[PDB]
Amino acid sequence: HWGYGKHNGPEHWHKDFPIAKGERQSPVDIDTHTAKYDPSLKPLSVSYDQATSLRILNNGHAFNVEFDDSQDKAVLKGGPLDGTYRLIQFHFHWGSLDGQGSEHTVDKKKYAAELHLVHWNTKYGDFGKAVQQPDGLAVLGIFLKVGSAKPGLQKVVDVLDSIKTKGKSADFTNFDPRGLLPESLDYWTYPGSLTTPPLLECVTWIVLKEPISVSSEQVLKFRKLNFNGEGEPEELMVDNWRPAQPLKNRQIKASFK
Ligand SMILES: CN1C(=O)NS(=O)(=O)c2ccccc21
Ligand SMILES: [Zn+2]
């Protein structure tokens, strides 16, 4: 099945998932000089004060911190969005080396990692219905660079030992995702897709311009995770990123001058 290896990685995905060669695939390179300021874009509204985290899962591709999305508790609104989008999970993509790991790039620059906060449009009732709609999801993407530690990430880092291998999960309550946000909410936005199979074209991407800084020790602990299950040969969970895909007939809009 699909993964990030030589024989099942991104260049192979189109055989099982032909939408991989579609018209609104993600990620993309953000050419900062070609992105156009759109003064009609509103400020983002990130309302995470009542977020209820539940669990952290190694799914064999990344680790997901999952939230209770049975009520409007942590929501994203405003910006390019119409309506209300509920936080369901976040996860990261990262590299084997600090010079790679992000999915989106900025003027071809690759960051060490990228955080995806995944939200679904409440007008579709559930996540599974939302992913079938062109405006079903809103993903807030945040770049990670290596420098000073991010204090609000440490609780995530310290539980990873307990979910080393595929299929392991651990209770992960009371985690505040506000501790993962940079100061500025300036962003770029474009219509795109999930970045792993099934690669559905259901995402409004909102990518923040300001990266967060994490320490080398923090990202090193991401790289100790495993793609494999327990009792299988160890394959380090690294380079779980899809490279930039053709922009095709899309414009990237900027919220800022
Ligand atoms: C699995 N996966 C990703 O890797 N990156 S993402 O496009 O933000 C995403 C969004 C929704 C569901 C799954 C997702
Ligand atoms: Zn992702």
From Swiss-Prot:
Question: Which source organism does the UniProt entry give?
Answer: Homo sapiens (Human)
* Residues at the active site: H61 (proton donor/acceptor)
Q: What is the effect of changing E114Q?
A: Strongly reduced activity and sulfonamide affinity
Task: Write down how the cofactor binds this protein.
Answer: Zinc. Can also use cobalt(II) with lower efficiency, but not copper(II), nickel(II) and manganese(II).
Amino acids binding Zn(2+):
H91, H93, H116
Characterize the regulation of its activity: Activated by X-ray, histamine, L-adrenaline, L- and D-phenylalanine, L- and D-histidine, L-His-OMe and beta-Ala-His (carnosine).
EC class name: lyase
Q: Which family does it belong to?
A: Belongs to the alpha-carbonic anhydrase family.
Q: Give the Pfam families listed for this entry.
A: Carb_anhydrase (PF00194)
Lyase as a keyword? Answer: yes
Q: What is the effect of changing H116E?
A: Strongly reduced activity
List the Gene3D superfamilies. Alpha carbonic anhydrase (3.10.200.10)
**UniProt subcellular location:** Cytoplasm; Cell membrane
Official protein name in the record: Carbonic anhydrase 2
Upper lineage is: Eukaryota, Metazoa, Chordata, Craniata, Vertebrata
Q: Which residue positions hold the site described Fine-tunes the proton-transfer properties of H-64? A: Y4, N59, N64
Effect ascribed to mutating N59L:
Reduced activity
This protein's assembly is summarised as:
Interacts with SLC4A4. Interaction with SLC4A7 regulates SLC4A7 transporter activity. Interacts with SLC26A6 isoform 4 (via C-terminus cytoplasmic domain).
